[PDB]
Amino acid sequence: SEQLKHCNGILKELLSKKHAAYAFPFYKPVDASALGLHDYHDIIKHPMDLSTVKRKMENRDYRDAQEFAADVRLMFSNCYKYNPPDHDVVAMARKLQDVFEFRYAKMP
């Protein structure tokens, strides 16, 4: 419970206005068709995004902090796998992952 509240706080921070300049690509599931990324679902077999993490937290799906962290990290991994490493979206993922990792490390 306490560890999951820490996770929920992190989630709320990742969704907050403070980080929006680099968090916004991760707010919703990638709409591959809409973006013309017709290879997305051949490369990324387990899509993840912050709205899905939020649904899982609200539904009490996550049983521990490790499960939560694995999904947030999956989201970043998908970005690093799909996009060339010099693309702006990758720089955004790295910055948001920094925010996540530093606060996650302050695990009660």
Cβ atoms 104, 69 nearer than 8 A: yes
Binding mask 70-99 toward a copy of itself (x if CB under 8 A, else -) reads: x--x--xxx-xx---x--------x--xx-
| DSSP 8-state assignment for residue 17 | G
Helix 65-82 with 88-104: angle, nearest 10 deg: 160
Whichever of 28 and 81 has its CB closer to a copy of itself, that residue is 81
Binding mask 7-46 toward a copy of itself (x if CB under 8 A, else -) reads: ----------------------------------------
Residue 53 found at the interface with a copy of itself (CB under 8 A):
no
How many Å apart are CA 9 and CA 16, to the nearest integer? Answer: 10
Cβ atoms 22, 96 nearer than 8 A: yes
Which residues make up the interface to a copy of itself (CB under 8 A)?
66, 69-70, 73, 76-78, 80-81, 85, 94, 97-98, 101-102, 104-107
